[model samples]
Target: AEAWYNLGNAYYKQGDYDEAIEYYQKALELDPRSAEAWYNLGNAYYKQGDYDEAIEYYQKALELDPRSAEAWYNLGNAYYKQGDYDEAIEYYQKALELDPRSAEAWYNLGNAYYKQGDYDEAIEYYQKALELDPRS
Candidate 1:
């Protein structure tokens, strides 16, 4: 619909993510369901590696669009690095459910399994991603 649900925050602000976060917050006060605002707020926190804060905003995003593959994938990444492979798998799987062709999501799912010490399952997912999307 828009270039992205949240690109105005990302693009308009460039490296000034701090200001973008404030902007998104203000935007949300006027229209809390503004999916764009929510995702960018998540992204603002995401870029700073604050998974917990990112999770809060992305959660708001999912409240409106469970199928938002972008938010879903980011949520998976947050949990993945935050030491929640099983939970990461849940979000990655949800992302895949919305778009099976997401090789990045598939790869992350593999990484999630690998982190959980399920090497065989990890390889299985990694192979699937490689077979379809080498870049992933």
Candidate 2:
């Protein structure tokens, strides 16, 4: 039911990144192909304001599944947050290559492109995202 993911986010929002990480690790122990778990673990580290560790966990997750659209999506955000816009775009595009319909991906594609002052591409992605998912 993806409850682990939901609760992990809940803990992260509560600022208990340690417990969030713990839950993610535990969830990983019980599940194979736990890309979400690994990413959540990385996300916990990301919340701790440590991108290096987050990337570490990200690599761990990706090594197991290169077509991890979710992981790639997150790496894009990580790079974006770190102000490495080029790297962010690279990963984001990689994710889109494998999974193009992700509304949030399109949303952030717009975000990164616009932030780089590239307006047309930004508008393209954003409008596409809104077309598919208004919630995004």
Candidate 3:
């Protein structure tokens, strides 16, 4: 099931959201408690413009595995889409706390700050993200 979930992730990386969601659903059916599967499902839903469903799945993933930085980071994205900048920032901070090396999290946090018009903070986080992954 984990391998299937990883395969689904590869598809997602290729922007094949439909196929990714199908495989992720298979992974969840095989292991309903799979935090990674739930997290990835949330991502697929988000990509498909299903913010409400994305939040629900993201919360489920976090409930199953509170220490998942990626889940937290993705939850922040869902919140941001809903225009909940403060909530997004909160989750982004949680992700950073769990994994300071998460360049993607930093990049997303910078976006949230930009939306909130916190240019200084946004620039700082952007620089941090770049330091972590120059190509990002």
> Candidates ranked by TM-score, best first?
1, 3, 2
Q: For candidate 1, lDDT tens digit of each residue in 1-136?
A: 2333354456546777777776677778777787767887898888888999999999999898777999999988889878989999999999999989888888999999999999999999999899888762
What is the alpha-carbon lDDT for the whole of candidate 2? 0.84
What tens digits encode model 2's per-residue C-alpha lDDT throughout 35-122?
7778779989987778878888887789888988988988888889988877888888989999988888888988999989999999
Q: Provide TM-scores for the models.
A: 0.88, 0.75, 0.76
- In the order shown, what is each candidate's alpha-carbon RMSD? 3.0, 3.8, 3.0
Give the residue spans of candidate 2 off by over 4 A. Answer: 1-14, 22-37, 134-136
Q: Per-residue lDDT tens digits of candidate 3, residues 1-136?
A: 8988999999999999899999999999899999889988898999999989999999999999999888888889889998888799999999999999989999989999999999999999999999999974
Candidate lDDT values, in order? 0.84, 0.84, 0.92
Clashes of 2: 0
User: By TM-score, is 1 or 3 better?
Assistant: 1
Model 1 Cα displacement at 46 (Å)? Answer: 1.1
Per-candidate count of clashing residue pairs (backbone under 3 Å): 1, 0, 0
